[PDB]
Each structure stands twice: as C-alpha cells, then as structure tokens.
Amino acid sequence: PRKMVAIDCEMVGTGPKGHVSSLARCSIVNYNGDVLYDEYILPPCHIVDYRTRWSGIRKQHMVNATPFKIARGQILKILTGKIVVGHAIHNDFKALQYFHPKSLTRDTSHIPPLMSLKHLTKKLLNRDIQVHSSVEAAQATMELYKLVEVEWEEHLARN
Structure with a gap:
C-alpha cells in the first residue's frame, strides 16, 4: 500500500511581462485530507504579475514567505515514493522542477x-471550491480521487 497525497499549486508571473509562471504557494494533503504542507513561496525572480484573479496571492503574502529554494526541498520530501493526486499537475512539475514518476501520478x-x-x-462533489x-x-482533488479510487486503479493495471 503506497501512501497517498494530493497537491495544489498557485503561480505568479515573473519576468519582463509576467510571462514566466513561478511557484508562489503550495498545499499537500493525505488520503484523509490532513495538512502535510501549506506555505507561501517567495519566487527567486521579482514578482511582476501576482495573478490574484487566479492566485489569490498579493504582496502581503510574500512577506514571511518560505523561499523557493527551501520549499522545493521541503515539498519533495513528502512526494517521494507517494502516489500524488493533482489537477493538471504536469503543468506544475516544471515550476517545481521535479517531474515525479508517471506510475505514481x-x-x-x-x-x-x-x-x-x-x-x-x-x-462531482457538490463542493464549491474557491472559498x-x-x-x-488539495482535499477536493483528494476526495475527487477517493470518489473514483476503486475504478481508477483497476484500469491502470488492465492496460
């Protein structure tokens, strides 16, 4: 039995026109939705676009923010060898610079x-996210998996 985790990431726009999506905040949960991680991440580049409409992140959060160097080291230690649940997570892999195995994705x-x-x-859950x-x-992505855990893993082996 592999331990399970679910993850959700928020990005900000760094670069000349905010074109580069940099990790700004992360949260990871168990199979039971308990918190393994939740911290504001200070990207190494200057934040040109906070994308608050999509991040919920402003400057006040980057105050007392765990730098990206540290957080990455922290975050990975959880994911190692765990089945990770995430919505369009390969898009975030590049901003974590960790491309976690596929048989655990x-x-x-x-x-x-x-x-x-x-x-x-x-x-699917009658839960209104964005509150x-x-x-x-993260818990939503987790419950979205437990909602289909049994039908998930069978087809993963049958093919």
Whole structure:
C-alpha cells in the first residue's frame, strides 16, 4: 500500500511581462485530507504579475514567505515514493522542477473513469471550491480521487 497525497499549486508571473509562471504557494494533503504542507513561496525572480484573479496571492503574502529554494526541498520530501493526486499537475512539475514518476501520478484533469477544478468539484462533489485555500483545492482533488479510487486503479493495471 503506497501512501497517498494530493497537491495544489498557485503561480505568479515573473519576468519582463509576467510571462514566466513561478511557484508562489503550495498545499499537500493525505488520503484523509490532513495538512502535510501549506506555505507561501517567495519566487527567486521579482514578482511582476501576482495573478490574484487566479492566485489569490498579493504582496502581503510574500512577506514571511518560505523561499523557493527551501520549499522545493521541503515539498519533495513528502512526494517521494507517494502516489500524488493533482489537477493538471504536469503543468506544475516544471515550476517545481521535479517531474515525479508517471506510475505514481494521478491527474484529476483527466479521470478516464469519468475542465476547471472549480466546476469539477461542484459537478462531482457538490463542493464549491474557491472559498483562498489551496488546502481546500488539495482535499477536493483528494476526495475527487477517493470518489473514483476503486475504478481508477483497476484500469491502470488492465492496460
């Protein structure tokens, strides 16, 4: 039995026009939705776009923010050898610069048992996400997996 975790990441726009998505905040949960991680991450570059409409992040959060160098080291130690649940997580792998194995990667962006996580978390759980809590968006991705855990893993072996 492999230990399970779910993750949700918020990015900010660094670079000349905020074109580069830099990790700004992360949250990781168990199979039971307990908190393994939740911290504001100070990107190494200057933050040109906070993308608050999509991040919920402003400057006040970057005060007392765990630098990206530290957080990455912290974050990875959880993920190692754990089955990780995440919505479009390969998009975040590059901003974590860790491209976690595929046989342990479960992307709620495609649940082949059968789109934003907001609509999918109401459309399937009757939970309204977006009520500034990557913790909540992590548990949502986690419960979205437990909702389909049994039908998930069988087809993963049958093919």
